[PDB]
Amino acid sequence: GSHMEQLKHCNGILKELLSKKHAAYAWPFYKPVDASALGLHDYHDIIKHPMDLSTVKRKMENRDYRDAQEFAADVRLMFSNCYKYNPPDHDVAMARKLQDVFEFRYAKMPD
Ligand SMILES: Cc1cc2n3c(c[nH]c(=O)c13)CN(C(=O)c1cccc3ccccc13)c1ccc(CS(C)(=O)=O)cc1-2
């Protein structure tokens, strides 16, 4: 799915993921994780490919994505980073709220 058509759909997803309707659970993913400031010990040992929505937006604005799948890969990388580093009952609950938005809207892509 290399179409612009599909990439436009992904672009609508990103803007919805950055909208104020989801800010309550989404804003921890707006910018890169500041592990050193937040005392996230070993964060960059355990997480070798950081990702966040500011990075996904840059890549989308620079038209660096070749198809929707690369897009999805990055968004799921961001969520996976969160699940891998944190315990199951870490306030991870915000990631699953946002991922439910992303996944349902990704599944609705034309094709
Ligand atoms: C992907 C991600 C983002 C954060 N992460 C944390 C643990 N593991 C993660 O994967 C993770 C630790 N973290 C918190 O625990 C936290 C404390 C106080 C209020 C919160 C409200 C919502 C979510 C987290 C917090 C905070 C704190 C602040 C920032 C924003 S910034 C520019 O300063 O880096 C990011 C995270």
Side-chain angles (χ1 to χ4, degrees), residues 1 5-110:
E5 8 153 353
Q6 282 191 348
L7 276 172
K8 177 33 170 153
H9 187 84
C10 294
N11 203 10
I13 290 169
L14 176 54
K15 320 301 261 131
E16 149 123 73
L17 301 179
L18 297 159
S19 58
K20 296 308 90 193
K21 311 289 189 178
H22 309 297
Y25 34 88
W27 68 261
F29 310 94
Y30 289 159
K31 303 291 210 269
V33 77
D34 191 356
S36 170
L38 298 158
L40 306 189
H41 192 250
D42 289 338
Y43 186 81
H44 294 287
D45 295 313
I46 294 155
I47 297 299
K48 308 249 194 190
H49 302 294
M51 190 57 54
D52 71 285
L53 289 171
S54 82
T55 296
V56 162
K57 129 204 151 76
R58 183 198 327 144
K59 289 163 90 165
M60 184 69 65
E61 287 185 316
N62 287 340
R63 299 299 183 248
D64 287 329
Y65 283 122
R66 307 178 212 111
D67 55 5
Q69 290 147 300
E70 286 170 13
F71 179 79
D74 271 351
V75 187
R76 284 173 182 155
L77 181 43
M78 175 188 86
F79 290 132
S80 294
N81 281 340
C82 190
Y83 310 133
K84 175 184 195 63
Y85 182 81
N86 304 282
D89 289 48
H90 192 300
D91 280 14
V92 161
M94 306 184 189
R96 295 167 176 161
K97 316 295 161 276
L98 194 61
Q99 184 163 24
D100 278 330
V101 185
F102 161 76
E103 301 285 2
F104 184 90
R105 199 84 184 295
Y106 187 64
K108 300 286 169 186
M109 191 174 53

